[PDB]
Coordinates of all heavy atoms in Angstrom, one line a residue:
Chain A
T25 N -33.6 10.5 -2.3 CA -34.1 10.6 -3.6 C -35.5 9.9 -3.7 O -36.5 10.4 -4.2 CB -33.2 10.0 -4.6 OG1 -32.0 10.7 -4.5 CG2 -33.7 10.0 -6.0
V26 N -35.6 8.7 -3.1 CA -36.8 7.9 -3.2 C -37.9 8.6 -2.3 O -39.0 8.8 -2.8 CB -36.5 6.4 -2.6 CG1 -37.8 5.7 -2.4 CG2 -35.6 5.7 -3.6
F27 N -37.5 8.9 -1.1 CA -38.4 9.6 -0.2 C -38.9 10.9 -0.7 O -40.0 11.4 -0.4 CB -37.8 9.6 1.2 CG -37.8 8.2 1.9 CD1 -37.3 7.1 1.2 CD2 -38.3 8.1 3.2 CE1 -37.3 5.8 1.9 CE2 -38.3 6.9 3.8 CZ -37.8 5.8 3.2
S28 N -38.1 11.5 -1.6 CA -38.5 12.8 -2.2 C -39.7 12.7 -3.1 O -40.4 13.7 -3.4 CB -37.3 13.4 -2.9 OG -36.3 13.9 -1.9
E29 N -40.0 11.5 -3.7 CA -41.1 11.4 -4.6 C -42.4 11.5 -3.7 O -43.5 11.8 -4.2 CB -41.1 10.2 -5.5 CG -41.3 8.9 -4.9 CD -41.8 7.8 -5.8 OE1 -42.9 7.9 -6.4 OE2 -41.0 6.8 -6.1
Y30 N -42.3 11.2 -2.4 CA -43.5 11.1 -1.5 C -43.6 12.5 -0.9 O -44.7 12.7 -0.2 CB -43.3 10.0 -0.5 CG -43.0 8.7 -1.2 CD1 -41.7 8.2 -1.0 CD2 -43.9 8.0 -1.9 CE1 -41.3 7.0 -1.6 CE2 -43.5 6.8 -2.5 CZ -42.3 6.3 -2.4 OH -41.9 5.2 -3.0
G31 N -42.7 13.3 -1.0 CA -42.8 14.6 -0.4 C -41.4 15.2 -0.2 O -40.5 14.9 -0.9
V32 N -41.3 16.1 0.8 CA -40.1 16.8 1.0 C -39.4 16.3 2.3 O -40.0 16.4 3.4 CB -40.4 18.3 1.2 CG1 -39.1 19.1 1.5 CG2 -41.0 18.9 -0.1
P33 N -38.3 15.6 2.1 CA -37.5 15.1 3.2 C -36.7 16.3 3.8 O -36.1 17.1 3.1 CB -36.6 14.1 2.6 CG -36.4 14.6 1.2 CD -37.7 15.3 0.8
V34 N -36.6 16.4 5.1 CA -35.8 17.5 5.7 C -34.6 16.9 6.4 O -33.5 17.6 6.4 CB -36.6 18.4 6.6 CG1 -37.7 19.2 5.8 CG2 -37.3 17.7 7.7
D35 N -34.7 15.8 7.0 CA -33.6 15.2 7.7 C -33.7 13.7 7.5 O -34.8 13.1 7.4 CB -33.6 15.5 9.2 CG -32.4 15.0 9.9 OD1 -31.3 15.2 9.5 OD2 -32.6 14.4 11.0
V36 N -32.5 13.1 7.4 CA -32.4 11.7 7.3 C -31.2 11.2 8.1 O -30.2 11.9 8.2 CB -32.3 11.3 5.8 CG1 -31.0 11.8 5.2 CG2 -32.4 9.8 5.5
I37 N -31.4 10.1 8.8 CA -30.3 9.5 9.5 C -30.2 8.0 9.1 O -31.1 7.3 9.1 CB -30.6 9.5 11.1 CG1 -30.6 10.9 11.6 CG2 -29.5 8.7 11.8 CD1 -31.1 11.1 13.0
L38 N -29.0 7.7 8.5 CA -28.7 6.4 8.2 C -28.0 5.8 9.3 O -26.8 6.2 9.6 CB -27.9 6.3 6.9 CG -28.2 5.1 5.9 CD1 -28.2 3.7 6.7 CD2 -29.4 5.3 5.2
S39 N -28.5 4.8 9.9 CA -27.8 4.2 11.0 C -26.9 3.2 10.4 O -27.2 2.3 9.7 CB -28.9 3.5 11.8 OG -29.8 4.5 12.3
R40 N -25.6 3.5 10.6 CA -24.5 2.7 10.1 C -23.6 2.3 11.2 O -23.4 3.1 12.1 CB -23.8 3.6 9.0 CG -24.6 3.8 7.8 CD -24.0 4.9 6.9 NE -24.2 6.2 7.4 CZ -24.4 7.3 6.7 NH1 -24.3 7.3 5.4 NH2 -24.6 8.5 7.3
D41 N -23.2 1.1 11.1 CA -22.3 0.6 12.1 C -20.9 1.0 12.0 O -20.3 0.9 10.9 CB -22.4 -1.0 12.1 CG -21.4 -1.6 13.0 OD1 -21.5 -1.5 14.2 OD2 -20.5 -2.2 12.5
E42 N -20.4 1.6 13.0 CA -19.0 2.1 13.1 C -18.0 1.1 12.8 O -16.9 1.4 12.3 CB -18.7 2.8 14.4 CG -18.8 1.9 15.6 CD -18.5 2.7 16.9 OE1 -17.4 2.8 17.2 OE2 -19.5 3.2 17.5
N43 N -18.3 -0.2 13.1 CA -17.3 -1.3 12.9 C -17.2 -1.7 11.5 O -16.1 -1.9 11.0 CB -17.7 -2.5 13.8 CG -17.9 -2.1 15.3 OD1 -17.0 -2.1 16.1 ND2 -19.2 -1.8 15.6
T44 N -18.3 -1.9 10.9 CA -18.4 -2.4 9.5 C -18.4 -1.3 8.5 O -18.0 -1.5 7.3 CB -19.7 -3.3 9.3 OG1 -20.8 -2.4 9.8 CG2 -19.7 -4.5 10.2
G45 N -18.8 -0.2 8.9 CA -18.9 1.0 8.0 C -20.2 0.9 7.1 O -20.4 1.7 6.3
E46 N -21.0 -0.1 7.4 CA -22.2 -0.4 6.6 C -23.4 -0.1 7.3 O -23.4 0.0 8.6 CB -22.2 -1.8 6.0 CG -20.9 -2.2 5.2 CD -21.0 -3.6 4.7 OE1 -20.7 -4.5 5.4 OE2 -21.4 -3.7 3.5
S47 N -24.5 0.0 6.6 CA -25.8 0.3 7.2 C -26.2 -0.8 8.2 O -25.9 -1.9 8.1 CB -26.8 0.3 6.0 OG -26.2 1.1 4.9
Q48 N -27.0 -0.4 9.2 CA -27.4 -1.3 10.3 C -28.7 -1.9 10.0 O -29.3 -2.6 10.9 CB -27.5 -0.5 11.6 CG -26.2 0.1 12.0 CD -26.2 0.6 13.5 OE1 -26.6 1.7 13.8 NE2 -25.8 -0.3 14.3
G49 N -29.2 -1.8 8.8 CA -30.4 -2.4 8.4 C -31.6 -1.6 8.7 O -32.7 -2.0 8.6
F50 N -31.4 -0.3 9.1 CA -32.5 0.5 9.4 C -32.0 2.0 9.3 O -30.8 2.2 9.3 CB -33.1 0.3 10.8 CG -32.2 0.7 12.0 CD1 -32.4 1.9 12.6 CD2 -31.2 -0.1 12.5 CE1 -31.6 2.3 13.7 CE2 -30.4 0.3 13.5 CZ -30.6 1.5 14.1
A51 N -33.0 2.9 9.1 CA -32.7 4.3 8.9 C -33.9 5.1 9.4 O -35.0 4.5 9.7 CB -32.4 4.6 7.5
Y52 N -33.8 6.4 9.3 CA -34.8 7.3 9.7 C -34.8 8.5 8.7 O -33.8 8.9 8.2 CB -34.5 7.8 11.1 CG -35.0 9.2 11.4 CD1 -36.3 9.5 11.6 CD2 -34.1 10.3 11.5 CE1 -36.7 10.8 11.8 CE2 -34.5 11.6 11.7 CZ -35.8 11.8 11.9 OH -36.1 13.1 12.2
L53 N -36.0 9.0 8.5 CA -36.2 10.2 7.6 C -37.4 10.9 8.1 O -38.4 10.3 8.5 CB -36.2 9.8 6.1 CG -36.2 11.0 5.1 CD1 -35.6 10.6 3.8 CD2 -37.6 11.5 4.9
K54 N -37.4 12.2 8.1 CA -38.5 13.0 8.5 C -38.9 13.9 7.4 O -38.0 14.4 6.7 CB -38.3 13.8 9.8 CG -37.3 14.9 9.7 CD -37.5 15.9 10.9 CE -38.8 16.7 10.8 NZ -38.8 17.7 11.8
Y55 N -40.1 14.1 7.2 CA -40.6 15.0 6.2 C -41.0 16.3 6.7 O -41.1 16.5 8.0 CB -41.8 14.4 5.5 CG -41.5 13.2 4.7 CD1 -41.3 11.9 5.3 CD2 -41.3 13.3 3.3 CE1 -41.0 10.8 4.5 CE2 -41.0 12.2 2.6 CZ -40.9 11.0 3.2 OH -40.6 9.9 2.4
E56 N -41.2 17.2 5.8 CA -41.7 18.5 6.2 C -43.2 18.5 6.3 O -43.8 19.3 7.1 CB -41.3 19.5 5.0 CG -41.6 21.0 5.3 CD -41.4 21.8 4.1 OE1 -40.2 22.2 3.8 OE2 -42.4 22.1 3.4
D57 N -43.8 17.5 5.7 CA -45.2 17.4 5.7 C -45.6 16.0 6.2 O -45.0 15.0 5.8 CB -45.7 17.5 4.2 CG -47.2 17.6 4.1 OD1 -47.9 16.6 4.2 OD2 -47.8 18.8 4.0
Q58 N -46.6 15.9 7.1 CA -47.0 14.7 7.7 C -47.7 13.7 6.6 O -47.6 12.5 6.7 CB -48.0 14.9 8.8 CG -47.4 15.1 10.2 CD -46.6 16.4 10.3 OE1 -46.8 17.4 9.6 NE2 -45.7 16.4 11.3
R59 N -48.3 14.3 5.6 CA -49.0 13.5 4.6 C -48.0 12.7 3.7 O -48.2 11.6 3.2 CB -49.9 14.3 3.7 CG -51.3 14.7 4.3 CD -51.2 15.5 5.6 NE -50.3 16.7 5.5 CZ -50.2 17.7 6.3 NH1 -51.0 17.7 7.4 NH2 -49.4 18.7 6.1
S60 N -46.9 13.3 3.6 CA -45.7 12.7 2.9 C -45.3 11.4 3.6 O -44.9 10.4 2.9 CB -44.6 13.7 2.8 OG -45.0 14.9 2.1
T61 N -45.4 11.3 4.9 CA -45.0 10.1 5.6 C -45.9 9.0 5.3 O -45.4 7.9 4.9 CB -45.0 10.3 7.2 OG1 -46.3 10.5 7.7 CG2 -44.2 11.5 7.6
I62 N -47.2 9.2 5.2 CA -48.2 8.1 4.9 C -48.0 7.7 3.4 O -48.1 6.5 3.1 CB -49.7 8.5 5.2 CG1 -50.0 9.9 4.6 CG2 -49.9 8.4 6.7 CD1 -51.3 10.5 5.1
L63 N -47.7 8.7 2.6 CA -47.4 8.4 1.2 C -46.2 7.5 1.0 O -46.2 6.5 0.2 CB -47.1 9.7 0.4 CG -48.2 10.5 -0.1 CD1 -47.7 11.9 -0.6 CD2 -48.8 9.8 -1.3
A64 N -45.2 7.8 1.8 CA -44.0 7.0 1.8 C -44.2 5.6 2.5 O -43.9 4.6 1.9 CB -42.8 7.7 2.3
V65 N -44.8 5.6 3.6 CA -44.9 4.4 4.4 C -45.7 3.3 3.7 O -45.3 2.2 3.5 CB -45.6 4.6 5.8 CG1 -45.9 3.3 6.5 CG2 -44.7 5.5 6.7
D66 N -46.9 3.7 3.1 CA -47.8 2.8 2.5 C -47.3 2.3 1.2 O -47.7 1.2 0.8 CB -49.2 3.5 2.4 CG -50.3 2.5 2.0 OD1 -50.7 1.7 2.9 OD2 -50.7 2.5 0.8
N67 N -46.5 3.1 0.5 CA -46.0 2.7 -0.8 C -44.7 2.0 -0.7 O -44.4 1.1 -1.5 CB -45.9 4.0 -1.6 CG -45.5 3.7 -3.1 OD1 -46.3 3.6 -3.9 ND2 -44.2 3.7 -3.3
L68 N -43.9 2.3 0.3 CA -42.5 1.7 0.4 C -42.5 0.5 1.3 O -41.7 -0.4 1.1 CB -41.6 2.7 1.1 CG -41.0 3.8 0.2 CD1 -40.7 5.0 1.0 CD2 -39.7 3.2 -0.4
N69 N -43.5 0.4 2.2 CA -43.6 -0.8 3.0 C -43.9 -2.0 2.1 O -44.9 -2.0 1.4 CB -44.7 -0.6 4.1 CG -44.8 -1.7 5.1 OD1 -44.5 -2.9 4.8 ND2 -45.4 -1.4 6.2
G70 N -43.1 -3.0 2.2 CA -43.4 -4.2 1.4 C -42.8 -4.1 0.0 O -42.8 -5.1 -0.8
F71 N -42.3 -3.0 -0.4 CA -41.7 -2.8 -1.7 C -40.3 -3.3 -1.6 O -39.5 -3.1 -0.7 CB -41.8 -1.3 -2.1 CG -41.4 -1.0 -3.5 CD1 -42.3 -1.2 -4.5 CD2 -40.1 -0.6 -3.8 CE1 -41.9 -1.0 -5.8 CE2 -39.7 -0.3 -5.1 CZ -40.6 -0.5 -6.1
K72 N -39.9 -3.9 -2.7 CA -38.5 -4.5 -2.7 C -37.6 -3.6 -3.4 O -37.7 -3.2 -4.6 CB -38.5 -5.9 -3.4 CG -39.3 -7.0 -2.7 CD -40.8 -6.9 -2.6 CE -41.4 -8.0 -1.7 NZ -42.9 -7.8 -1.6
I73 N -36.5 -3.2 -2.7 CA -35.4 -2.4 -3.2 C -34.2 -3.2 -2.9 O -34.1 -3.7 -1.8 CB -35.4 -1.0 -2.6 CG1 -36.7 -0.2 -2.9 CG2 -34.2 -0.2 -3.0 CD1 -36.7 1.2 -2.3
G74 N -33.2 -3.2 -3.8 CA -32.0 -3.9 -3.5 C -32.2 -5.4 -3.3 O -31.3 -6.0 -2.7
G75 N -33.3 -5.9 -3.7 CA -33.6 -7.3 -3.5 C -34.2 -7.6 -2.2 O -34.4 -8.8 -1.8
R76 N -34.5 -6.6 -1.4 CA -35.2 -6.8 -0.1 C -36.4 -5.9 0.1 O -36.4 -4.8 -0.4 CB -34.1 -6.6 1.0 CG -33.5 -5.3 1.1 CD -32.4 -5.2 2.2 NE -31.3 -6.2 1.9 CZ -30.3 -6.5 2.7 NH1 -30.3 -6.1 3.9 NH2 -29.3 -7.3 2.2
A77 N -37.3 -6.4 0.8 CA -38.6 -5.7 1.1 C -38.4 -4.7 2.2 O -38.1 -5.1 3.3 CB -39.7 -6.7 1.4
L78 N -38.6 -3.4 1.9 CA -38.5 -2.4 2.9 C -39.6 -2.4 3.8 O -40.8 -2.7 3.5 CB -38.4 -1.0 2.2 CG -37.0 -0.5 1.9 CD1 -37.1 0.9 1.2 CD2 -36.3 -0.3 3.2
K79 N -39.3 -2.0 5.0 CA -40.3 -1.9 6.1 C -40.4 -0.5 6.6 O -39.4 0.0 7.1 CB -40.0 -2.9 7.2 CG -41.0 -2.8 8.4 CD -42.4 -3.1 8.0 CE -43.3 -3.1 9.2 NZ -43.0 -4.1 10.2
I80 N -41.5 0.1 6.4 CA -41.6 1.5 6.8 C -42.7 1.5 7.9 O -43.7 0.9 7.7 CB -42.0 2.5 5.7 CG1 -41.3 2.2 4.4 CG2 -41.6 3.9 6.2 CD1 -39.8 2.2 4.4

Side-chain angles (χ1 to χ4, degrees):
Chain A
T25 299
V26 171
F27 285 50
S28 292
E29 70 163 294
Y30 309 108
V32 178
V34 294
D35 184 49
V36 64
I37 297 172
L38 213 312
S39 303
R40 290 167 288 212
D41 171 69
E42 60 179 275
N43 307 271
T44 53
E46 303 184 275
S47 314
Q48 299 194 271
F50 70 97
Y52 151 73
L53 186 154
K54 68 162 292 187
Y55 291 80
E56 189 187 275
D57 189 281
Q58 277 65 26
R59 284 58 54 167
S60 301
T61 68
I62 51 194
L63 274 169
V65 173
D66 190 79
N67 186 90
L68 277 155
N69 184 334
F71 188 81
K72 292 68 183 179
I73 298 182
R76 59 185 64 188
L78 268 177
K79 177 61 178 299
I80 323 297

